[PDB]
Amino acid sequence: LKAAQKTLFPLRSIDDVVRLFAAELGREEPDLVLLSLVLGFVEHFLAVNRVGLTYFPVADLSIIAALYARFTAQIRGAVDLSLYPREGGVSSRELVKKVSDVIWNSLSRSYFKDRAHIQSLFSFITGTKLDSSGVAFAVVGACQALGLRDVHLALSEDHAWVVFGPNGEQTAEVTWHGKGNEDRRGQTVNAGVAERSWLYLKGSYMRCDRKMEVAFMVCAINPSIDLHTDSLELLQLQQKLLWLLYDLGHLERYPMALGNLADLEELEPTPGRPDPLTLYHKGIASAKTYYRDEHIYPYMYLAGYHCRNRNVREALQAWADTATVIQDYNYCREDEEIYKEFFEVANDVIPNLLKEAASLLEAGSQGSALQDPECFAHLLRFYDGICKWEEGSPTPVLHVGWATFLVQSLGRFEGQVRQKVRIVSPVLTFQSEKMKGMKELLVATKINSSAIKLQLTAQSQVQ
Ligand SMILES: FC(F)c1nnc(N2CCN(c3ncnc4sc(CC(F)(F)F)cc34)CC2)s1
């Protein structure tokens, strides 16, 4: 550590931690290793072990510098740079693989790999444990510790790797994904980009600079103490650090960080700041501007906010928008997280929303989503995008499980509402062949349940 990095210690409060992040973010290269160790230290003493806590776990320079020394010793001793000569100020694939193997080989042989609080360099040093994306971040922190200015974190919506090399144009796998998936460590991500899977976002993934890597570690703070309790101290810290980053411009290219900040503001708004809705919309604008509108979660964050607020119309619209993104992907093997999310929206969340709407309609509600043909159009657009996603994918998406809920959800709208949607080859155009074939069935007084099931699952025959 440099003398100027040490002058704010000891850190005695949330605001002292924010001052350290501001100071580092004002430097040429914010120090990822220092900042991750500080966040892991404070998270450990606020969420993992609160014994003796009276306000804030003071981070003394001696403690943090010792952890920093342990990390830098471990990386510098194990990775000999002279063996990997650097042309043009850029790293080689062999060097990036070496750093990734050093981190990997340091981890405990066996542990629950999706526990909370194993994301930071504090966990790596004190517990020899990291989660999947934590391994990728630790490789980028180790590379910065080694002076490898070209190695940066790459992020999709469900995975992490690194970019490096001439023009930052190379990619390398550095960590595992999911469970059971054989890992492709050391390889490029080009096969996954070429197959048009959600996991690699058709190439529209995030290439972080160092300030975005700071934003990633801030998003990675986990305030959870247990299943029903969060640390208010860590929530406040994360929220303040996200605002710092926002004010400096470093969330411009980071949709998920904007959604996380909107979620925090919903929980506890900061006076004089944008509303959660404005922030969800900025996340969607960011995805449109920098990522070809190929991200799913900007719309999912928005839908979840409208869902929690029972804005049924706007929740349906946002989930329809989610499906309009997914329709231009191929459902591939390791995309199971987004499949689980769409399955839960179609087969649990929407049905529960519409069941409540049906009860409130019975009680005299006006302006109900169930009487709005634009809402029925959003429900149809959601299923259309799911059906179009399925087209040209290796694995199928839909099955009879889904058909039961579709028939139920359609039946929540009276025929006189359903009949007002105009399906053009509210006005809606279908992209999927499944929904085009379903058109006549959708606007019938009594829903033909068996015919709908046949059309959605392309089941050839009946009993
Ligand atoms: F839109 C709603 F459904 C969501 N609510 N929380 C969502 N999250 C929680 C925050 N989150 C994230 N937030 C910021 N950055 C990243 S980078 C990343 C992929 C990986 F973990 F690095 F591998 C995930 C992620 C993942 C998605 S989506």
UniProtKB/Swiss-Prot annotation:
Major location (coarse): nucleus
Region (Interaction with FANCD2) location: 192-364
Name of this chain's protein: Menin
GO cellular component, one term: chromosome, telomeric region
Impact upon substituting residue 24 to K: In parathyroid adenoma and MEN1
Entry's localization field: Nucleus
Any matching Pfam family: Menin
Consequence recorded when altering residue 264 to P: In MEN1; almost no effect on JUND-binding
An annotated Gene Ontology molecular function: Y-form DNA binding
Result after altering residue 238 to P: Found in isolated hyperparathyroidism; likely pathogenic
Source lineage: Eukaryota, Metazoa, Chordata, Craniata, Vertebrata
CDD domains: Menin
Self-association and partners: Component of the MLL-HCF complex, at least composed of KMT2A/MLL1, MEN1, ASH2L, RBBP5, DPY30, WDR5, HCFC1 and HCFC2. Component of the menin-associated histone methyltransferase complex, at least composed of KMT2B/MLL4, MEN1, ASH2L, RBBP5, DPY30 and WDR5. Interacts with POLR2B. Interacts with POLR2A phosphorylated at 'Ser-5', but not with the unphosphorylated, nor 'Ser-2' phosphorylated POLR2A forms. Interacts with FANCD2 and DBF4. Interacts with JUND (via MBM motif); inhibits the interaction of JUND with MAPK10 and the phosphorylation of JUND by MAP kinases MAPK8 and MAPK10.
Function: Essential component of a MLL/SET1 histone methyltransferase (HMT) complex, a complex that specifically methylates 'Lys-4' of histone H3 (H3K4). Functions as a transcriptional regulator. Binds to the TERT promoter and represses telomerase expression. Plays a role in TGFB1-mediated inhibition of cell-proliferation, possibly regulating SMAD3 transcriptional activity. Represses JUND-mediated transcriptional activation on AP1 sites, as well as that mediated by NFKB subunit RELA. Positively regulates HOXC8 and HOXC6 gene expression.
Outcome (variant: residue 297 to A): Reduced interaction with KMT2A
Disease (UniProt): Familial multiple endocrine neoplasia type I: Autosomal dominant disorder characterized by tumors of the parathyroid glands, gastro-intestinal endocrine tissue, the anterior pituitary and other tissues. Cutaneous lesions and nervous-tissue tumors can exist. Prognosis in MEN1 patients is related to hormonal hypersecretion by tumors, such as hypergastrinemia causing severe peptic ulcer disease (Zollinger-Ellison syndrome, ZES), primary hyperparathyroidism, and acute forms of hyperinsulinemia. MEN1 inactivating mutations are responsible for hyperfunctioning of the parathyroid glands and subsequent primary hyperparathyroidism. Primary hyperparathyroidism can occur in isolation or in association with multiple endocrine neoplasia.
Family annotation (InterPro entries): Menin (IPR007747)
Result of altering residue 154 to P: In MEN1; loss of JUND-binding
Effect on the protein upon substituting residue 10 to L: In MEN1; no effect on histone methylation; almost no effect on JUND-binding
